[PDB]
Design a protein around this ligand. Structure first.
Ligand SMILES: Cc1cc2nc3c(=O)[nH]c(=O)nc-3n(C[C@H](O)[C@H](O)[C@H](O)COP(=O)(O)O)c2cc1C
Ligand SMILES: Cc1cc2nc3c(=O)[nH]c(=O)nc-3n(C[C@H](O)[C@H](O)[C@H](O)COP(=O)(O)O)c2cc1C
Ligand SMILES: Cc1cc2nc3c(=O)[nH]c(=O)nc-3n(C[C@H](O)[C@H](O)[C@H](O)COP(=O)(O)O)c2cc1C
Ligand SMILES: Cc1cc2nc3c(=O)[nH]c(=O)nc-3n(C[C@H](O)[C@H](O)[C@H](O)COP(=O)(O)O)c2cc1C
Lengths: 334, 334, 334, 334
């Protein structure tokens, strides 16, 4: 019986080999951006409303043409067999059962077609390959398999310098592979190539600059994820949560605006919503639950988050996520 | 001989069973709002005035048609028999003797009529019940027993997630019951039903949004308590002390504006007053005194607070609470 | 060979009985204002100037018609025989030899006439007595003995609540007495009575509100000391250093504006000057030096401060204290 | 295999005698400015750009008429034989091989002509001597030896009070001397004398005030280094990084604007660039590498920095240093 997401981290730490825990937990450089994701959320306080009608409180949203049970999706995390033998299938099954979209990775350790076969609301995360033709074939595979959005990761021209992994000499075990296979920096031209080759909504993940958010809308993106990649890419990149309010104002409803980085409770989901987010992604906590107890662990995590989101919304006087978006916030200290 | 309110916490910790101490001390979630109540007060510095006439320094106020000895009332705290066998009677007696209003709880462990019989300035705190008729009968009982205000708690559509209590598996002992008995979310319609059924001032406890404060005045409230429920309801709710100045400006004398959360000295009372509060509520410290030494403990606490309030006022050049409200403040760090 | 003022605190702690060290070190309440005096100085950074003429660097100022060797005076500290058998005579002698004004206390443990006989630039600090006539006789004694300013302490309607002293049960030893004798709250009328009865400059010590600074000028004060009494009076009073810039602007040269609280180096003196102070008072460090090594200890402290002030001024491109007052500052963190 | 600059500090601490490590690490006074250099960098977050062309990422700049491989030069650090027997020759050789300018010190422990003979891009740092004629002869020597800029240090009218060195009784060993020999405060007249006597660009090191930056341009400086001398001069001097943005705006391209103090990674170089710096100087880390492993150590440090700079630039969407200068930043906490 886990009562917070932090209960799951302790459990994952006990079970995982240190180098794998470090691959999961770590960030780039001095981990300044990793820590700042948490610091930034902790500075935000919500101004709750009272005495509103809560007879029909609902945490549901519509996003990319589909109902989701919560304003949340499972973030793309590569190589989930690192954490549990069932890997992506355990996570996707639990996500399906919870009514939460699951993001299938380019670097999944089970093939995208197998994960999509689980059902639910799968999205597909794209890393741009060596040549346009292979990238587009990967998008086509995902679309053919029933994925409902393409989450194009745009903050990885190359992978950041993760010093825990360098110090550990971390490498994939032989029993974990990139199952979609037997990369080059993306540009705005790559985005256009993807947009031209699919009817699915294209979601640009890793936007932090206001003008990049505007340009994403102009480029025909259906959404963006305001994100510093969990502090794993540029060390010193601003937390997404700190850019979110400015970005939401600038796009002025032109696309869905998601955020990630450090979401660790329903209260944090509420903060993100109050700052203007359509929805959040959650990464590391899902993997802690997977490591701790497989599919059942992820189910328990999603049930806990669902309860915390409903609790936070109602306590703040919000019968819907739309109402939560209209909450005001105040910045505090420590 | 206690010289600060913190002397009483140490004493209460020694005597109380851990799970009861945790029920008293704890907040919801990560306890961010609990801690922020203290942090926020610690950031406020007063700009004292010098060389004023202090020949007749008085800490008295008039509130809801009655003189009070200090700008303070005992906050509603449920189930006071948890802390001492005399429970609410010990606290109400000490409050009476000190000239401080005592708030009788809906969830009192001694009946409201017995506590009101003690005398003094009893107020009655309402939680909205299952149906209008039982709620209003509770208000009528309180009024018939001589309670002088109805403190309608508006920040509890349901109880928050107190993780200490969940981890402890905390439950009321068999010897503690809700003595007023053998709940549903309140709305603005509930407030109107209460206002229509009593001549007593209705005070809305748990207001944080400026527009909710304005609407409280428009709804015919005689007062509000600007409060995050001691960090026990929404984890991440702004501290009341941080909204107080804005709220005081917005209501512009249309109702009494009280504050609570983390008041732990006469200096803190002065800070609250300087930010515009009519009066404060004090919760946990009263219960520490009750646990430590029963009625005599609460008397000693109230005597200590009275001395600290008079000391702080005079040192700041204020011969009256009204003068303290005209003090300016400056925000600092740590 | 002491290289910082902090070397002297360690030495004083070793030699003094704990309760006496606590009388010296302590503040009122939770010691929030005591700590904030240091925090506030630590937040201030100086913007030094380069490449100026430093051929004739001088730390001298003119204040209340007399040259002083540094922009500094010894603060009034009662009962200096607590710290060393020679008490006030040791401190006054060292101050004289260093060219620094010494403030003789109303509650001195050696008579004001004996201390004034030492020579140098004595000032006299007044606490307002029971009746106008005794207060004025004390002022007349000081003037007759050759004191050159009256430092009227205006932040002590009564003494603050020093919890270290209460916990220790601290009392003066039989061998320490108020040697000027065999009190009531001061008002603006008291200030006028003093101003009318002396040709000496009257300096109001303990001003924090901007309007009190203006009123001090209007009342005919020759100076003010912007001060929270070393955090010993109102716990939660703003540090003087945080009000200094606003106060300097408001009086616009109408009187001398001194500051105290937490000055612990020549760099701190420079910060105070850059914020607009005419001069600083230094309290506790002088007593650490007295406790550590008597008159010689105070001489060494004043020599160290003199070197640090000259060093800081020159490094900041200031050939005079007037130039230091024209330096700009920037607030930082921790 | 060092993966961060902090790996080199640990290695230098192990090998160096404590008093030499302290000479290197220490600052003046309480070391407030030393610590603030790091604090200030840690507060800066970069807003990276995405999806830009990175086909030809280059870290090169042109400065003072010469290409440099990175926007970085080795700061002037006196007496490098303190740290390794090869001293300045080891550092200059590694700098040459890395394509980074090396600043030869007035107080070098190997003669300026020997160090310049190493080749590369040597600059020469000037301390103003006793008389104009010797100062100018030193400038002429440097110019004759092929130095390409004169870095006139302007923040040392005299040396600051380094308390670690005073406590240690630190003195140069007999085997370390000022090899350029067998000082007086600089002024603007000194700057003019230097500018009139050389065709080399004159760079004023130790500017913090905006008006001093403007006056440097008016005086014919080719550059400035915005710097508090690594917290070794005025204790309480603002960090250069905190003045940089204001200074860059004020000079509006009239000279090169460099910064130093606490640069410890390629991410920090990126922050400095984003705040408007043309280039940075790096001091202590170069000496840690020298102490740890001589010339090879410095080579490894410069290779690590080069990789971190390229990584940070690309992750932030910058194909050139000019692009990095156009990045925006956001201030955060801790
Ligand atoms: C172990 C690990 C692997 C990741 N793999 C990917 C990936 O393949 N693609 C991607 O776009 N993001 C990846 N991310 C970033 C996440 O999608 C997400 O942005 C980040 O974890 C921030 O969320 P968190 O604090 O909830 O973990 C990964 C993160 C982690 C920790
Ligand atoms: C143990 C406990 C029980 C409480 N019970 C109630 C209650 O029944 N009704 C209510 O309106 N507030 C209740 N409160 C909230 C208090 O009235 C008050 O808002 C809160 O304790 C903040 O004040 P403090 O920091 O002085 O404790 C309770 C608080 C505590 C700690
Ligand atoms: C032990 C002690 C005794 C003091 N006595 C007096 C006094 O008699 N009159 C007065 O105006 N201030 C008195 N002060 C306040 C000082 O004059 C000064 O305002 C305060 O110490 C702040 O300076 P510091 O941080 O340099 O100690 C006293 C302070 C201390 C610590
Ligand atoms: C041991 C030591 C010696 C130094 N010697 C000089 C010098 O001779 N001339 C000079 O202009 N700066 C000197 N500096 C200052 C550096 O050039 C530079 O401004 C400072 O170290 C800040 O950079 P850092 O944090 O990268 O060390 C010295 C610094 C150190 C630590």
């Amino acid at each position: 019986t886990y009562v917070s997401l932090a209960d799951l981290e302790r459990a994952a730490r006990d079970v995982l080999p240190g180098e794998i825990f470090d691959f999961l937990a770590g960030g780039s450089g001095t981990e300044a951006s990793l820590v700042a994701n948490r610091t930034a959320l902790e500075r935000v306080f919500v101004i709750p409303r009272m005495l509103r009608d809560l007879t029909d409180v609902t945490t549901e949203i519509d996003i990319f043409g589909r109902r989701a049970a919560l304003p949340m999706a499972v973030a793309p995390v590569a190589y989930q067999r690192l954490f549990h033998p069932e890997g992506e299938l355990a996570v996707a099954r639990a996500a399906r059962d919870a009514g939460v979209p699951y993001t299938i990775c380019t670097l999944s350790s089970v093939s995208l077609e197998e994960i999509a076969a689980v059902g639910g609301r799968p999205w597909f995360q794209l890393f741009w390959l060596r040549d346009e033709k292979r990238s587009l074939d990967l998008v086509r595979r995902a679309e053919d398999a029933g994925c409902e959005a393409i989450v194009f990761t745009v903050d990885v021209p190359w992978m950041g310098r993760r010093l825990r992994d360098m110090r550990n000499g971390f490498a994939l075990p032989e029993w974990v592979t990139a199952a979609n296979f037997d990369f080059a920096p993306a540009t705005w031209e790559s985005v256009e190539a993807v947009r031209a080759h699919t009817d699915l909504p294209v979601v640009l993940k890793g936007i932090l600059a206001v003008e990049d958010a505007r340009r994403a809308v102009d480029a025909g993106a259906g959404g963006i994820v305001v994100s510093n990649h969990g502090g794993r890419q540029l060390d010193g990149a601003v937390p997404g949560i700190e850019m979110l309010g400015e970005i939401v104002a600038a796009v002025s409803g032109g696309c869905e605006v998601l955020v990630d980085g450090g979401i660790r409770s329903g209260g944090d989901v509420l903060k993100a919503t109050a700052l203007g987010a359509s929805a959040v992604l959650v990464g590391r906590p899902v993997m802690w639950a997977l490591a701790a107890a497989g599919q059942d662990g992820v189910r328990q995590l999603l049930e806990l988050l669902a309860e915390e989101v409903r609790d936070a919304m109602g306590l703040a006087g919000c019968e819907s996520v739309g109402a939560a978006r209209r909450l005001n916030t105040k910045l505090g200290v420590v």
